[PDB]
Design a binder for this molecule. Structure first.
Ligand SMILES: [Zn+2]
Lengths: 33, 319, 131
């Protein structure tokens, strides 16, 4: 079908999208320490 | 592969970073840095990972293996990042951004929360670390130099002259002086803190060297703390001395032809372990290796397509 | 409802009965419990996916941002391919397609994620009572 191709299309690009480690900046610190 | 005693890297507007060697002008590896420009790059103390930060993201690249991708990336900030740095033991990373924040990042994969945020009223251009790794110097576009102490939570504000933005500030590893330059070329030098024990963070005005009539871009000492190279927008770099601040050697890349009309500025410089050869990265799409005595260049690297505004050059402790 | 809380949080954040208009008169499997004699269907990590699927179908009826809503449904079928395998969820979506209005390309996008299913519960119970 059409959505079947789209579903597997996302799978192919998802394999190479998990090779990077991301570290976000959370608004927290040792304020109480 | 970064498994060499001496490594060298350059980056700029070409969206790629080129790795070189001092032995020969060949290029080893080309990495990918998409939809961004590299402001400044530095290598971790472990010499197994390099840091490249620009426009709201700090992309980390691998050196031991051959990975053309930013394996480790950081986000959260909303503006550009002026500079990056690391502790001598590789514990935490301090970054200064254009969003008027000079924060500290924690490299421990746990909820240690070793991060501190410092707020200023103007965007900052240069961030430096004290040689004892206990203080911190932050400078904004208002010309006010802030001395931040990690032990306490108070920062002294020092301003030599207002209305002129500063661009760089560096402290020699031997802890003998403290120099900074601004948008007019004046390179103020302050004798650093004498209270090495309790960190009394006292400063006095030592001298002022009038040079670099045009904009001043970057100033940096040498590992032996006997030289001082100050970049400038007039396509010239001057190396000073710590004895009486006389012109030890003057360097220029001007072709002498009026038809060029400032073809490219001189952005950064870096010394070797023995403080004998210097590496300069100009905005003429190439970088050169100079010598402090003969003046004539040693090698030349021309693998970039666009201008390069940052370079990282380090080797082993032995020199 | 879940719609108010979903916009204030994230799908992964919450994870760190679900059918709204499900009555025992308009379901493919539940309506046959009394008339035929089927057995009751058998089964918190899964109930939070039923709401997410349903809210994206409802938001797909406005045709305002179809690409954003279509992407949100394809990811669920990729990370959790077994959530589109319950007969009751299909009945709820089929019931919603009758009252609301959907564009033909968007209507064909739905009812096409359920093509590669087995629906073992209906087959098991129908065989026993008929035999
Ligand atoms: Zn049902």
């Amino acid at each position: 079908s059409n959505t079947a191709q789209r579903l597997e299309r996302l799978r192919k690009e998802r394999q190479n999208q998990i090779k990077c480690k991301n570290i976000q900046w959370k608004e927290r610190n040792s304020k109480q320490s | 592969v970064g498994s060499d005693p001496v490594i060298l890297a350059t980056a700029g507007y070409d969206h790629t970073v080129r790795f070189w060697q001092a032995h020969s002008g060949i290029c080893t590896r080309t990495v990918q840095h998409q939809d961004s420009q590299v402001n400044a790059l530095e290598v971790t103390p472990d010499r197994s990972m390099i840091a490249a930060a620009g426009y709201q993201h700090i992309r980390m690249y691998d050196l031991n293996s051959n990975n053309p991708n930013p394996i480790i990336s950081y986000d959260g900030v909303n503006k550009n990042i002026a500079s990056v740095g690391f502790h001598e033991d590789g514990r935490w990373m301090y970054t200064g951004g254009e969003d008027c924040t000079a924060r500290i990042w924690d490299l421990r994969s746990r909820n240690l929360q070793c991060q501190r945020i410092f707020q200023v009223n103007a965007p900052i251009n240069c961030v430096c670390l004290h040689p004892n790794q206990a203080e911190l110097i932050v400078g904004d576009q208002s010309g006010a130099i802030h001395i931040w102490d990690l032990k306490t939570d108070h920062n002294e504000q020092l301003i030599p002259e207002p209305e002129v933005s500063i661009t760089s500030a560096h402290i020699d590893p031997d802890a003998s002086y403290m120099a900074a330059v601004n948008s007019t070329g004046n390179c103020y030098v302050w004798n650093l803190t004498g209270g090495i024990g309790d960190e009394v963070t006292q400063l006095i005005p030592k001298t002022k060297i009038p040079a670099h009539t045009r904009y001043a871009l970057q100033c940096r000492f040498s590992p032996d703390s006997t030289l001082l190279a100050t970049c400038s927008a007039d396509q010239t770099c001057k190396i000073w001395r710590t004895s009486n601040f006389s012109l030890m050697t003057e360097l220029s890349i001007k072709s002498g032809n009026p038809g060029e009309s400032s073809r490219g500025w001189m952005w950064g410089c870096a010394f070797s372990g023995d403080s004998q050869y210097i590496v300069t990265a100009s905005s003429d799409n190439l970088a050169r290796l100079w010598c402090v005595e003969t003046g004539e260049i040693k090698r030349e690297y021309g693998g970039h397509q666009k201008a390069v505004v940052c370079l990282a050059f380090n080797d082993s402790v032995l020199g | 409802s879940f719609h108010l809380l979903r916009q204030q949080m994230s799908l992964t954040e919450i994870m760190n009965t679900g059918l709204q208009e499900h009555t025992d008169d308009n379901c493919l499997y539940c309506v046959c419990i009394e008339i035929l004699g089927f057995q009751p269907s058998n089964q918190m990590c899964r109930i939070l996916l039923r709401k997410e699927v349903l809210r994206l179908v409802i938001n797909l009826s406005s045709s305002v941002s179809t690409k954003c809503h279509e992407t949100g449904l394809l990811t669920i079928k990729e990370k959790y391919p077994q959530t589109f395998d319950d007969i009751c969820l299909y009945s709820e979506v089929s019931h919603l397609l009758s009252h609301c209005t959907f564009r033909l390309p968007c209507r064909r996008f739905i009812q096409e994620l359920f093509q590669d299913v087995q629906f073992l519960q209906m087959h098991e119970e129908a065989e026993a009572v008929l035999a």
